[PDB]
Design an enzyme around this catalytic site. Structure first.
Site, short mmCIF file in Angstrom:
data_model
loop_
_atom_site.label_atom_id
_atom_site.label_comp_id
_atom_site.label_asym_id
_atom_site.label_seq_id
_atom_site.Cartn_x
_atom_site.Cartn_y
_atom_site.Cartn_z
N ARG A 220 -8.63 68.90 11.16
CA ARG A 220 -9.44 70.10 11.43
C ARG A 220 -8.94 70.77 12.69
NH1 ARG A 220 -12.35 65.91 10.16
NH2 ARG A 220 -12.60 65.73 12.40
N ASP B 273 -11.07 59.12 11.33
CA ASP B 273 -11.47 60.36 10.71
C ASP B 273 -12.03 60.34 9.35
OD1 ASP B 273 -12.03 62.95 11.85
OD2 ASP B 273 -10.62 63.84 10.48
N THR B 274 -12.28 59.31 8.63
CA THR B 274 -12.77 59.34 7.25
C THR B 274 -14.22 59.01 7.05
OG1 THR B 274 -11.79 57.18 6.85
CG2 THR B 274 -10.34 59.07 6.25
N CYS C 207 -6.58 55.40 -2.48
CA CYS C 207 -6.92 54.91 -1.17
C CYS C 207 -7.19 53.41 -1.19
CB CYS C 207 -8.12 55.68 -0.64
SG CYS C 207 -8.83 55.01 0.85
N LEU C 208 -6.41 52.77 -0.36
CA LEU C 208 -6.40 51.33 -0.15
C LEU C 208 -7.64 50.94 0.68
CD1 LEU C 208 -2.54 50.95 0.70
CD2 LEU C 208 -3.81 49.65 -1.00
N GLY C 209 -8.08 51.83 1.53
CA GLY C 209 -9.23 51.56 2.38
C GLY C 209 -10.57 51.81 1.75
C1 HEM Z 1 -14.62 58.24 3.22
C2 HEM Z 1 -13.57 57.44 3.33
C3 HEM Z 1 -12.16 57.77 2.84
C4 HEM Z 1 -11.76 58.66 1.93
C5 HEM Z 1 -12.59 59.72 1.17
C6 HEM Z 1 -10.33 58.49 1.75
C7 HEM Z 1 -9.57 59.30 0.93
C8 HEM Z 1 -8.24 59.06 0.70
C9 HEM Z 1 -7.41 59.88 -0.20
C10 HEM Z 1 -7.96 61.04 -1.03
C11 HEM Z 1 -6.21 59.31 -0.23
C12 HEM Z 1 -4.93 59.69 -0.98
C13 HEM Z 1 -4.16 60.88 -0.35
C14 HEM Z 1 -3.10 61.45 -1.28
O1 HEM Z 1 -3.09 61.12 -2.50
O2 HEM Z 1 -2.40 62.23 -0.58
C15 HEM Z 1 -6.22 58.18 0.71
C16 HEM Z 1 -5.12 57.37 0.94
C17 HEM Z 1 -5.10 56.29 1.81
N1 HEM Z 1 -6.20 55.85 2.53
FE1 HEM Z 1 -8.07 56.43 2.36
N2 HEM Z 1 -9.85 57.46 2.57
C18 HEM Z 1 -10.99 57.01 3.22
C19 HEM Z 1 -10.99 55.90 4.08
C20 HEM Z 1 -9.92 55.09 4.40
C21 HEM Z 1 -9.93 53.96 5.32
C22 HEM Z 1 -11.17 53.44 6.05
C23 HEM Z 1 -8.66 53.54 5.42
C24 HEM Z 1 -8.08 52.32 6.19
C25 HEM Z 1 -7.98 52.40 7.53
C26 HEM Z 1 -7.85 54.33 4.53
C27 HEM Z 1 -6.51 54.10 4.21
C28 HEM Z 1 -5.75 54.72 3.24
C29 HEM Z 1 -4.37 54.50 2.97
C30 HEM Z 1 -3.53 53.36 3.59
C31 HEM Z 1 -3.97 55.42 2.09
C32 HEM Z 1 -2.60 55.56 1.46
C33 HEM Z 1 -2.33 54.90 0.09
C34 HEM Z 1 -0.91 55.25 -0.39
O3 HEM Z 1 -0.39 56.32 0.05
O4 HEM Z 1 -0.48 54.48 -1.27
N3 HEM Z 1 -8.63 55.32 3.96
N4 HEM Z 1 -7.46 58.03 1.24
C1 MYT Z 2 -5.78 63.40 3.53
C2 MYT Z 2 -5.58 62.00 4.29
C3 MYT Z 2 -4.89 61.22 3.09
C4 MYT Z 2 -6.96 61.35 4.47
O1 MYT Z 2 -8.01 61.88 4.46
C5 MYT Z 2 -6.93 59.84 4.77
C6 MYT Z 2 -6.22 59.44 5.85
C7 MYT Z 2 -5.93 58.03 6.02
C8 MYT Z 2 -6.58 57.20 5.11
N1 MYT Z 2 -7.39 57.63 4.02
C9 MYT Z 2 -7.50 59.02 3.91
C10 MYT Z 2 -4.82 62.23 5.49
C11 MYT Z 2 -5.38 62.76 6.64
C12 MYT Z 2 -4.70 62.93 7.85
C13 MYT Z 2 -3.37 62.48 7.89
N2 MYT Z 2 -2.78 61.90 6.78
C14 MYT Z 2 -3.51 61.81 5.62
#
Ligand code: HEM
Ligand code: MYT
Length: 405
Positions: A177, A242-243, A348-350
């Site tokens: 943002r 930030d999520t 998303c792994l998280g």
């Molecule tokens: C409200 C919580 C969250 C939402 C809505 C969210 C959403 C997403 C989305 C939409 C993606 C895929 C981005 C793409 O396809 O460009 C993503 C990827 C990812 N997120 Fe989450 N995220 C959240 C929380 C987290 C947390 C807590 C972590 C761990 C610290 C995390 C780690 C990851 C990782 C490692 C990926 C990459 C997977 C890959 O590229 O194979 N996220 N997330």
């Molecule tokens: C859009 C995305 C994937 C996001 O929201 C996010 C970031 C890390 C983990 N899970 C989700 C993001 C956000 C900021 C930088 N890189 C990626």
């Protein structure tokens, strides 16, 4: 600031959406984006804002584009282009089959088995934070809980000092943002200056923290490089900071306004998990995209190689074709359909970590503070971007209606 329309774009496909400053912001961020799904709007539009890019508006197209990494590459996933350009996080700026090996590692660190291990801390920190708030009859939910809760757990996982929170969060905020205070590349560099020393230290002297595991992991039978590690850790940081932080405030803001929803959860706790998915669908918050690797004809629109497309994760579950009465929160929907956590290879792994944090918060807050509302005359402001947020969430309650546990 609209960019001149490229030659290939039919003028009937223009819809000037500003992902950074949608028109209806006042009504709420999800409501502001949902304008894209009105009848007058084609399924795939071009916006001249933020340099010109496509936006798929329907759950069907989004999932399709997400599955299709051959055409829609993660190489430049952020708009505007300069940001997508500077973007080099792993595994996020990579396509299969390359992405796979880094994903597998990132999974090691945030996956299920880690959550399972961290569970008692999550519950401990929630309970503590809530108990401390309870007798006050008022907080700033965003600064009082939504920030500390998820952040501190991350800081613990990562083995990083709580003292670094403010500095890290600022920088994280600039990516999703943007303020105008700093460019993506500057923001990215600064997080990188932070990480480097740390990685070095943890390649020499390994801990058990997430950074240590990442810094010393194996990818394609060989050791990760320093640069690769720096690049995974950058993603992890943003995910931690930030999520969940933003998600909790939307949910909380909804809970503050809907007594019947709160009650439902208090009497029929078996519904929490179902409720969490529904809130994930309704308060969905992420929007990134892909770049066209070539000329390609997608649902009758000609996309030119290098064209960027925003595929808003947010929008799938808001789509009427996907969910009946999409703006209504109903904990007993037969099928909650969303792509909040993404779709395709980058899922998303998280997610496991985020669901555990959401469920604990609902169960733990409702327990102790069943009855609360938004402060009188507080106007709640949403913020749009890659990850949307809530600016401040003033809550008030009668201490006398709380229960200490
Ligand atoms: C409200 C919580 C969250 C939402 C809505 C969210 C959403 C997403 C989305 C939409 C993606 C895929 C981005 C793409 O396809 O460009 C993503 C990827 C990812 N997120 Fe989450 N995220 C959240 C929380 C987290 C947390 C807590 C972590 C761990 C610290 C995390 C780690 C990851 C990782 C490692 C990926 C990459 C997977 C890959 O590229 O194979 N996220 N997330
Ligand atoms: C859009 C995305 C994937 C996001 O929201 C996010 C970031 C890390 C983990 N899970 C989700 C993001 C956000 C900021 C930088 N890189 C990626």
């Amino acid at each position: 600031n609209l960019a001149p329309l490229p030659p290939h774009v039919p003028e009937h496909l223009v819809f000037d959406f500003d992902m950074y400053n949608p028109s209806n912001l006042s009504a709420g961020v999800q409501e502001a984006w949902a304008v894209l799904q009105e009848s007058n709007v084609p399924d795939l539009v071009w916006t001249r804002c933020n340099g010109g890019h496509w936006i798929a508006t329907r759950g069907q197209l989004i999932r399709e584009a997400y599955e299709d990494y051959r055409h829609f590459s993660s190489e430049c996933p952020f708009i505007p282009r300069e940001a997508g350009e500077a973007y080099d996080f792993i595994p996020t700026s990579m396509d299969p089959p390359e992405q796979r090996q880094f994903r597998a590692l990132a999974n090691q660190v945030v996956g299920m088995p880690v959550v399972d291990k961290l569970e008692n801390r999550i519950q401990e920190l929630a309970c503590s934070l809530i108990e401390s708030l309870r007798p006050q009859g008022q907080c700033n939910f965003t600064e009082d809980y939504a920030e500390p809760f998820p952040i501190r757990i991350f800081m613990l996982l990562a083995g990083l000092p709580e003292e670094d929170i403010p500095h890290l969060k600022y920088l994280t905020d600039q990516m999703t943002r943007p303020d105008g205070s700093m460019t993506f590349a500057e923001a990215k560099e600064a997080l990188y200056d932070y990480l480097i020393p740390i990685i070095e230290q943890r390649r020499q002297k390994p801990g058990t923290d997430a950074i240590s595991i990442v810094a010393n992991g194996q990818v394609n039978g060989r050791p990760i490089t320093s640069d690769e590690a720096k690049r995974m850790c950058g993603l992890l940081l943003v995910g931690g900071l930030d999520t969940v932080v933003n998600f909790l405030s939307f949910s909380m803001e909804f809970l503050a306004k809907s007594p019947e929803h709160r009650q439902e959860l208090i009497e029929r706790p078996e519904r929490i998990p179902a409720a969490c998915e529904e809130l994930l669908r309704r308060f969905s918050l992420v929007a990134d995209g892909r770049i066209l690797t070539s000329d390609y004809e997608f649902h009758g629109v000609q996309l030119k190689k290098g064209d960027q497309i925003l595929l808003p994760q947010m929008l799938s579950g808001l789509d009427e074709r996907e969910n009946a009465c999409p703006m209504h929160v109903d904990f007993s929907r037969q099928k909650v359909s969303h792509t909040t956590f993404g779709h395709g290879s980058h899922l998303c792994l998280g997610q496991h970590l985020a669901r555990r944090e959401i469920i604990v918060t609902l169960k733990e807050w409702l327990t102790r503070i069943p009855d609360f509302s938004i402060a009188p005359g507080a106007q709640i402001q949403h913020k749009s971007g890659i990850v949307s947020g809530v600016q401040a969430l003033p809550l008030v309650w009668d201490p006398a209606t709380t229960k200490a546990v």
